[PDB]
Amino acid sequence: TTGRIVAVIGAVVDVQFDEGLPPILNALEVQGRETRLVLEVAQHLGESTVRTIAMDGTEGLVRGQKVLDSGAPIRIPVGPETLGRIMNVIGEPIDERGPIKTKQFAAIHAEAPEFVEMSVEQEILVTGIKVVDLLAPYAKGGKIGLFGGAGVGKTVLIMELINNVAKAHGGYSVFAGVGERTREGNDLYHEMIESGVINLKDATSKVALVYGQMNEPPGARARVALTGLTVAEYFRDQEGQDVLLFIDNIFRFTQAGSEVSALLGRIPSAVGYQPTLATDMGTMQERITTTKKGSITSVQAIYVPADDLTDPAPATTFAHLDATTVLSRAIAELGIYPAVDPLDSTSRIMDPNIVGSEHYDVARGVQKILQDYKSLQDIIAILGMDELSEEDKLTVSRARKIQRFLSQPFQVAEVFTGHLGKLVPLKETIKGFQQILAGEYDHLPEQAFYMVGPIEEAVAKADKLA
Amino acid sequence: TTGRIVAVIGAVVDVQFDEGLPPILNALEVQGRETRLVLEVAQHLGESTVRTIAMDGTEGLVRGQKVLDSGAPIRIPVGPETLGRIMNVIGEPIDERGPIKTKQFAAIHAEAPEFVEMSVEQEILVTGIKVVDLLAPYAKGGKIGLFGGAGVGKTVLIMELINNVAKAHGGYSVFAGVGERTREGNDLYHEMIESGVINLKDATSKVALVYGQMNEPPGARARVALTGLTVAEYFRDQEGQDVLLFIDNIFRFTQAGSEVSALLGRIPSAVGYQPTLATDMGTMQERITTTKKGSITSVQAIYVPADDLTDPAPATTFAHLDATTVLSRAIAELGIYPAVDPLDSTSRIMDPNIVGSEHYDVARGVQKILQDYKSLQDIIAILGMDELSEEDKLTVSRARKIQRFLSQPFQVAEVFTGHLGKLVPLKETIKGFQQILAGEYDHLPEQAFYMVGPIEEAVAKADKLAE
Amino acid sequence: LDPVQKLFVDKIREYRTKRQTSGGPVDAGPEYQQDLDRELFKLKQMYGKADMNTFPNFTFEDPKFE
Amino acid sequence: DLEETGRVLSIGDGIARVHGLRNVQAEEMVEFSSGLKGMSLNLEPDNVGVVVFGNDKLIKEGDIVKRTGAIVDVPVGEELLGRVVDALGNAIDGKGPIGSKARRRVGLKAPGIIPRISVREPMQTGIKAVDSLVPIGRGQRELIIGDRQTGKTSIAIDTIINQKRFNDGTDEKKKLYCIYVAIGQKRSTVAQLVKRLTDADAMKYTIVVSATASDAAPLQYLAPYSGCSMGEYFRDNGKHALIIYDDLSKQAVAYRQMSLLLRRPPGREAYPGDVFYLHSRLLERAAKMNDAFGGGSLTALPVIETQAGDVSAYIPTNVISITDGQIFLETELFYKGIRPAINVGLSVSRVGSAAQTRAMKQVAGTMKLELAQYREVAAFAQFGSDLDAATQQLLSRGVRLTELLKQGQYSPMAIEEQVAVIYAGVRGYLDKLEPSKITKFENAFLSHVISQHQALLGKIRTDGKISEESDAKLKEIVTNFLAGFEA
Amino acid sequence: EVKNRLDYHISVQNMMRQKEQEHMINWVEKRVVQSISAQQEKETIAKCIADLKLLSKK
């Protein structure tokens, strides 16, 4: 079927398909649009005319310019060969090594897993990173939201995570560059290239990069969310995967939703927000989960919008957040890479009755200790150490050991660290803390807890010294 | 005439009567409607169509359905037999004692009494509640507004007035539970039976109950007010009567209005509030009066959503008011029941004459000190306290005593209080403050004044506490 | 209907032919079998780790002579 | 057989202007082609504004919308006590199909005063704090207001669990059919929850109506009314229904959005206000009925999830003004590890008493009060203040009492235990003990008395009212137990 | 431990039978859905019963 430009007002193209009534979300390809000018059917206005949203820019728009309905949503390559390919949203490379070369294609909406599909009570994904595991132990399938230090090697940390896990457990990754600067995607690009977690000669390119950047029309960016999902579902179900799904920064996606909302003639809402904000999300989130198919585990860069949250979206997001990451400058400032703050590396599912107090209390003891120590840190800040009880002194040192024990070298940043990285097996980590907690090593170099992997290696590191 | 449902877009039932278009305020009876479905004509929309309001549900309607215009508003029995009867908006029982049989019938609108028809000057009524009288020295037959948030003891409070006072005034009353939270209306009801304030033995059951609940369409909720008014007007004019008119809550009327405005194809103006907020209300409030034939003393619950008063609605409200009972969430939260914002809770009839100067001055002194204190709150809030004039320190405490003294336990809500609440004959009150002012108590702990009745007793209460 | 019971017959016939035979699944090829194996592994973890077709043995306990 | 159909006049936005079928009933639930339902809300002449339950990516223009010719009903029946359904009343449990082949109008009015009756019923939650301090009967609208798995959700769960004993009991007259209308809680969330319920198999006496996070908004919207209808049935089959409306806040969004999509504007807080009507009407159906309704009750525990505690928000204000009290829960306490995280200064049951036993009164009167004061001296006194012995005591004790109402998540209880342990504390049996060990004490104590003094407990349950002898027996039991607790 | 062995086999046969049932069904129906013009009279019986609607509705 063909459609006609009946109206173009910016990237809202109302196309009268002059003979078609393809449902909404049916992807249209505009004919005479060399560059894949996808219009997504948006409303059936009547009159065989649909409001479509151009998802590619508008130009040269002949009145009645011809459009051929692609009749279903965008079908996109889905297949492992994407790992090592940067596509735009449309699933066209932007890695430009000709096309990406799956055969298994998918229309870019996927649907929620349902009750019957569930795997009813979730599971921690473990990274082997002390901070992660301890403080916000991840859930496989879980959507974790990254508030976090900019350019601190946030991404790097993420690479490291990918490294630790997606390698470890055979998870793969999808990166949805939402609202990314070309620059930032670049940054990543080389970071991955460099890291060799994208390998343009190896399938150790473990990440398909899908980009839905600012510079696109809204629709694309908006939809990049569905798209990214669609890939991971491919990996999930098909490749059985526990996927790590980076959608970064989903916020801008959201923005895009709202942007269009207006321009979908719709009322968005107060604070600009599309009133459907939640459903959009809900529906999106509900695709993302854990099932009898694996998990799509979501590592989501999440901007603190307007550094406020009052603004409904994050507020909603909180539901959609389940384990929470604020990556923290303080920690960073302490030179500690890991730079995470524990009191933020939390999980709404991190609750003792709801996960466990082994984390929660060993942590509470720890978090206590550090904070308590923080309470002392102000005291000490005035007084020095002297005055305290020795137990406090001990605890300070311990807190500090523990702290130091969180400093963990990077494999993916020998360039920064001058070290290999490390990983820490959770039991051993914890055990570690039991030791320090037990005070066991508090007669040892505290700074031997600095930058190590196993707590044993902190211990080891102490020894060579004394 | 017959009209056809041409559009029912919600309970705005757009009717086209082809069989003329007789005036607005025509009540239409929808034919084929299980519920006798009153529509009030609102607009002759033009071309044989009227916009009407369903006040009832909109069920089963087939667009076309015949409505036979009843051609005039809802006519309802009015007069004394309604007393002790629980009526619905459509002036029909829910007493569940069947029809009411007081054969003056009425359109629920009535229009404001002429200038001459007003009782020109009203004179203080009283209640005996210190706080109340003090700040709002009651006016005979006034419209008293309860600004107030979410029935927190608000509702209890209104009741409390009813209990002490509505009892105290012997003559008939009208209670309009508008939007009323039926459960409490049950309770109240049952209580009236219980108390024998309603008796199914007499209409000397001093209260006729009208309820126009919140499971109802707006159309009902908007209009029940008019209804209640019409009735009380019966008692006022016809029966003399200081009808005590309980409206809980006018807000829901209003609310009902605002909500429809949109649907009325109108603009639901600022805050969503209808353009006509004033006129509907105003005209309505103006229907309420103490005419030269009596009083409708109206204690009108005013929900103030999120208690904003700046909020146009209350802003308007003030215009009609006579005594404002402003409930203060700020106060309330301190556990205080009474909840009032005192220096907002007022009665215009503050007078060295009317309230006599004794009250007046005492009050003015009080008002002042509290106001002053008020100044201090801000100060201490930010400046801690402690270096102030010690007179202030004293007052601060005193104010709290005064406050506390203004606090009264609940006399009905021992269930809430675990106390009985009291009443303070006005002079003991004036005196009361004079006494505290006199510092007579003020070399004491502050504690005792809380939840008290008469000031002497607060002293008594002091003693027990002075231990 | 009864011209629609003419289709219903058709299906009933194929069900028996398969059941008293198999070709893979008659109409399914390896593809069925392969899918199963992907589900079958994960279920072992949900259901235990062994003994699925063979009765569990048990062992018994000890003490300290004091 | 265009003689039961119409063509979608326009569709966009899941907003179906529907052509034809002017035969339409007001409030007719219609069915669109796709198995998707809609409701013909708005009878415009030339279209029917039909709310789409579901989505229109699943539709195209001109689509036939066929009458269902039915005003909204929900399937109703008791086998749903033992089912999780979607709003349409279809097994999203997927167990089998609904046993419910009764249907019931969802839009049934909240009955009158006379068609109702007040409460005298009590209802229990096993949550000490609750049953005591906001002691709740049945009919009652009580707002649960609270935040991100503060057990916010948990709270309902333990309560339900608690009813298990009752559903294992004979308190049929109190048999509480629980309806947890789950609004906005994702499939996963639900999955956990449901699962927990399964495990508790409270589900046998339970509907879980689930409109997850994903949902088409009208579904979400509808779902409570649905739940409501189903519960009204029970109520009306004499029973005592407990509906947990979870949460209308989200519903409100959904609706609002719906309104806005209906182009219908809103008011205050951008919110169109007849969500109040909505809910009010919904919640008005929460009531305690007279005898005609078999004395029924539908106790409503609506949930609104606070965010920001801006009760100031219209919607909370609304709800408060509707409810018969609220349980405000305080998160801070939660971080402190405190579940129940309540601020019962901010929780009230203005009712309270219809639900109470002298047993409870006998300890609670004092306690509630003690806590009030305690709280007061928590609030003014010592924290870096004074050291008057009285108040210091109140604090010690108080502090004790605090723990004592502090209840683990997944910990509903029998009332008698509760009165018992509470009694213990009330009567100051633990000032002489440091707070943590109370907890230990209690468990131990509890199991002890369960074991031996099940007699006594039994009795205490039986009379519903502690008795002086018992007091002594108890006292002894405790004192000694306590004595054991130490030595 | 005894149950764990058994219910796996049941569950596999159940899911396996549904994944036969669906797969045969779509394949049979997707093969044989052709003879409607060969036997028109499924619409003649539509018009037969449809005449016993067009008469016998009212």
UniProtKB/Swiss-Prot annotation, chain A:
EC number: 7.1.2.2
Residues engaged in binding ATP: 151, 153-156, 181
Modified sites of kind Phosphothreonine: 254
Transmembrane residue ranges: none
Swiss-Prot/TrEMBL catalytic activity: ATP + H2O + 4 H(+)(in) = ADP + phosphate + 5 H(+)(out)
Residues with PTM N6-acetyllysine: 66, 103, 140, 201, 206, 368, 422, 427, 464
InterPro entries documented for this protein: AAA+_ATPase, ATP-synt_VA_C, ATP_synth_F1_bsu, ATPase_a/bsu_AS, ATPase_alpha/beta_chains, ATPase_F1/V1/A1_a/bsu_N, ATPase_F1/V1/A1_a/bsu_N_sf, ATPase_F1/V1/A1_a/bsu_nucl-bd
GO BP annotations, alphabetical order: proton motive force-driven ATP synthesis; proton motive force-driven mitochondrial ATP synthesis
Sequence positions that bind Mg(2+) 1: 155
Record's GO cellular component terms: mitochondrial inner membrane; mitochondrion; proton-transporting ATP synthase complex
Keyword presence, Transport: yes
Record's subcellular location: Mitochondrion inner membrane
Membrane topology: Peripheral membrane protein
HAMAP family tied to this protein: ATP_synth_beta_bact (MF_01347)
Family stated for the protein in its record: Belongs to the ATPase alpha/beta chains family.
Subunit note: Homotrimer. Component of the ATP synthase complex composed at least of ATP5F1A/subunit alpha, ATP5F1B/subunit beta, ATP5MC1/subunit c (homooctomer), MT-ATP6/subunit a, MT-ATP8/subunit 8, ATP5ME/subunit e, ATP5MF/subunit f, ATP5MG/subunit g, ATP5MK/subunit k, ATP5MJ/subunit j, ATP5F1C/subunit gamma, ATP5F1D/subunit delta, ATP5F1E/subunit epsilon, ATP5PF/subunit F6, ATP5PB/subunit b, ATP5PD/subunit d, ATP5PO/subunit OSCP.
Full protein name: ATP synthase F(1) complex catalytic subunit beta, mitochondrial
From Swiss-Prot, chain C:
Top-level taxon in the UniProt lineage: Eukaryota
Gene Ontology BP term (one): proton motive force-driven ATP synthesis
CC terms in the record's Gene Ontology section: mitochondrial inner membrane; mitochondrion; proton-transporting ATP synthase complex
Signal sequence extent: none
Compartments, as annotated in UniProt: Mitochondrion; Mitochondrion inner membrane
Keyword Repeat: no
Modified residues (N6-acetyllysine): 6, 11, 44, 49, 64
Residues found modified as N6-succinyllysine: 49, 64
Molecular function GO labels: proton transmembrane transporter activity
Keywords: Acetylation, CF(0), Hydrogen ion transport, Ion transport, Membrane, Mitochondrion, Mitochondrion inner membrane, Phosphoprotein, Transit peptide, Transport
Function of the molecule: Subunit F6, of the mitochondrial membrane ATP synthase complex (F(1)F(0) ATP synthase or Complex V) that produces ATP from ADP in the presence of a proton gradient across the membrane which is generated by electron transport complexes of the respiratory chain. ATP synthase complex consist of a soluble F(1) head domain - the catalytic core - and a membrane F(1) domain - the membrane proton channel. These two domains are linked by a central stalk rotating inside the F(1) region and a stationary peripheral stalk.
Family the UniProt entry places it in: Belongs to the eukaryotic ATPase subunit F6 family.
Full protein name: ATP synthase peripheral stalk subunit F6, mitochondrial
Curated annotation (Swiss-Prot), chain D:
Post-translational events: Acetylated on lysine residues. BLOC1S1 is required for acetylation.
Site, Required for activity: residue positions: 347
UniProt membrane topology term: Peripheral membrane protein
Ligand binding (ATP): 149, 151-154, 407, 409
Alphabetical UniProt keywords: Acetylation, ATP synthesis, ATP-binding, Cell membrane, CF(1), Glycoprotein, Hydrogen ion transport, Ion transport, Magnesium, Membrane, Metal-binding, Methylation, Mitochondrion, Mitochondrion inner membrane, Nucleotide-binding, Phosphoprotein, Pyrrolidone carboxylic acid, Transit peptide, Transport
Modified residues (N6-acetyllysine): 57, 60, 66, 95, 101, 164, 173-174, 195, 239, 361, 368, 432, 440, 465, 473, 475
This protein's GO CC annotations: mitochondrial inner membrane; mitochondrion; plasma membrane; proton-transporting ATP synthase complex
Modified residues (N6-succinyllysine): 95, 101, 164, 173, 195, 239, 361, 432, 440, 465, 473
GO biological process, one term: proton motive force-driven ATP synthesis
GO molecular function ontology, one term from the record: ADP binding
Binding site for Mg(2+): 153, 246
Modification Phosphoserine occurs at: 10, 40, 100, 118
Localization in the cell: Mitochondrion inner membrane; Cell membrane
Modified positions (Phosphothreonine) in chain numbering: 68
Glycosylation sites: 10
Subunit structure: Homotrimer. Component of the ATP synthase complex composed at least of ATP5F1A/subunit alpha, ATP5F1B/subunit beta, ATP5MC1/subunit c (homooctomer), MT-ATP6/subunit a, MT-ATP8/subunit 8, ATP5ME/subunit e, ATP5MF/subunit f, ATP5MG/subunit g, ATP5MK/subunit k, ATP5MJ/subunit j, ATP5F1C/subunit gamma, ATP5F1D/subunit delta, ATP5F1E/subunit epsilon, ATP5PF/subunit F6, ATP5PB/subunit b, ATP5PD/subunit d, ATP5PO/subunit OSCP.
Curated annotation (Swiss-Prot), chain E:
Subunit relationships: Component of the ATP synthase complex composed at least of ATP5F1A/subunit alpha, ATP5F1B/subunit beta, ATP5MC1/subunit c (homooctomer), MT-ATP6/subunit a, MT-ATP8/subunit 8, ATP5ME/subunit e, ATP5MF/subunit f, ATP5MG/subunit g, ATP5MK/subunit k, ATP5MJ/subunit j, ATP5F1C/subunit gamma, ATP5F1D/subunit delta, ATP5F1E/subunit epsilon, ATP5PF/subunit F6, ATP5PB/subunit b, ATP5PD/subunit d, ATP5PO/subunit OSCP.
Function comment: Subunit b, of the mitochondrial membrane ATP synthase complex (F(1)F(0) ATP synthase or Complex V) that produces ATP from ADP in the presence of a proton gradient across the membrane which is generated by electron transport complexes of the respiratory chain. ATP synthase complex consist of a soluble F(1) head domain - the catalytic core - and a membrane F(1) domain - the membrane proton channel. These two domains are linked by a central stalk rotating inside the F(1) region and a stationary peripheral stalk.
Top-level lineage group: Eukaryota
UniProt name for this protein: ATP synthase peripheral stalk subunit b, mitochondrial
Taxonomy of the source species: Eukaryota, Metazoa, Chordata, Craniata, Vertebrata
Similarity comment text for this entry: Belongs to the eukaryotic ATPase B chain family.
Subcellular location: Mitochondrion; Mitochondrion inner membrane
Positions where N6-acetyllysine occurs in the chain: 30, 42, 53
Gene field: ATP5PB
